Amino acid sequence: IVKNGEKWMDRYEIDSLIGKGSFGQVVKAYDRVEQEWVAIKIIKNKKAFLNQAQIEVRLLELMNKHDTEMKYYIVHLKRHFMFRNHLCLVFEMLSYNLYDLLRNTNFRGVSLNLTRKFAQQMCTALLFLATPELSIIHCDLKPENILLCNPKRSAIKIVDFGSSCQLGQRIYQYIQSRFYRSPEVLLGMPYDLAIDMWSLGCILVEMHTGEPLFSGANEVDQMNKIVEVLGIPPAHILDQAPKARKFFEKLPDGTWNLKKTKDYKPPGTRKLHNILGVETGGPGGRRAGESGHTVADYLKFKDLILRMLDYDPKTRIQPYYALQHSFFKK
């Protein structure tokens, strides 16, 4: 829709398309005033996309005014304008995304040491979004929405607040990308910032193994793959879940079981300790005898992930406490 030389408002010179999504397009452009390259998110000229992007602008401007630190793992919105009836959001330029990074490993994963560096930045971002006066739920964390700041370095920023909402400003029941969708959302329950911690746990396993932890083809398959690793969810959760009976069945003594389909490993027997290869040289044994990949290192990582993948969103580890975990201690 935009030529690779087009000039906007005697300020921006469009170079190239660097991204696209349901929302519209992302272009690289030169800002003559700041004398720098910028990324311009161009929203489709349709009401549905405009209105949701106006929420995204509001949440990014809310973050910008909380300049008392920990805000620097979120992509910086520089400004926004209307042009040709497109809402346009101007960001700093970043580099390539963590899915691209995994693709580049041939989906064999990055080291525990680089996974730790990503985990510490993402926990810090989630600590910032949990600041009471922000209380922002990202709602679509996944490798594609985490970008390197610089192709030479391991700094990252989160992008895409297109699904995001403040606590108590929920619009959609059906949210998150399926692989990274929290049990509370699959179960149709009111959700809070804990869904992002669930996503992050899924993401960190994937960054190290090269493969998604829970690759469901649909919601029923998604919940079944979660149950393979983590077992049947606690009764107290299932007793409150509008969609419990999408996946489970309640028995005489207040117990729940999987709804069985026509012919999964039995509940809780696909152990994260074997996905990670804690005692077997890491994922597919590919880290056998590499530095920083000892059994003790792996056990700390496994402990932290199992805290991120708590079924109970009330007891699931929170960002501050994740940052104090021994996985991050030198």
Ligand SMILES: Cc1oc2ccc(-c3cc(N)nc(N)c3)cc2c1C
């Ligand atoms: C290189 C680069 O730099 C970027 C900076 C911001 C965003 C961006 C994309 C979407 N969908 N939402 C937001 N908030 C930012 C995308 C990019 C890309 C791609």
Ligand SMILES: [Cl-]
């Ligand atoms: Cl385990």
